[PDB]
Amino acid sequence: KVFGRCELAAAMKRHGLDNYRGYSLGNWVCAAKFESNFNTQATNRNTDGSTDYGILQINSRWWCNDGRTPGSRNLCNIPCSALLSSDITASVNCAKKIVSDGNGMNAWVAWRNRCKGTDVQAWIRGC
Ligand SMILES: [Cl-]
């Protein structure tokens, strides 16, 4: 599915992302916009043989297991296929582990380049 902006904000808030590990909700909404364009089924292959999966483009080298990525660590202990559900639970649970690993939201390239430093609260304004 393709979430609306406020629709995703409300779902992410219900799943505990607002202010999680220091990151207000607008950060997470902006990240999803620029990672997946709010599409729960987005996938993108990378040069290292990994693929990024779902609404938050979670990577198959470090975080989820897709069975075809060399050097897999599966630190979220989740099959990547689960991260293509229209229900965001598995992606949020893995994102919480990623953002707790020591480098904040820097794991999300699109967030680093297109959200960080902007007024991210605009992403939840009006919701
Ligand atoms: Cl604005």
Curated annotation (Swiss-Prot):
Substrate binds at D101. Residues 1-127 form the C-type lysozyme domain. In the egg white and polymorphonuclear leukocytes. Its EC number is 3.2.1.17. InterPro entries: Glyco_hydro_22, Glyco_hydro_22_CS, Glyco_hydro_22_lys, Lysozyme-like_dom_sf. It is an enzyme of class 3 (hydrolase). SUPFAM superfamilies: Lysozyme-like (SSF53955). It catalyses: Hydrolysis of (1->4)-beta-linkages between N-acetylmuramic acid and N-acetyl-D-glucosamine residues in a peptidoglycan and between N-acetyl-D-glucosamine residues in chitodextrins. It comes from the Eukaryota. One of its GO terms (molecular function) is lysozyme activity. Pfam families: Lys (PF00062). The active site is at E35, D52. Keywords: Allergen, Antimicrobial, Bacteriolytic enzyme, Disulfide bond, Glycosidase, Hydrolase, Secreted, Signal. It is found in: Secreted. One of its GO terms (biological process) is defense response to bacterium. Monomer. Belongs to the glycosyl hydrolase 22 family. Lysozymes have primarily a bacteriolytic function; those in tissues and body fluids are associated with the monocyte-macrophage system and enhance the activity of immunoagents. Has bacteriolytic activity against M.luteus. This is Lysozyme C. It comes from Gallus gallus.
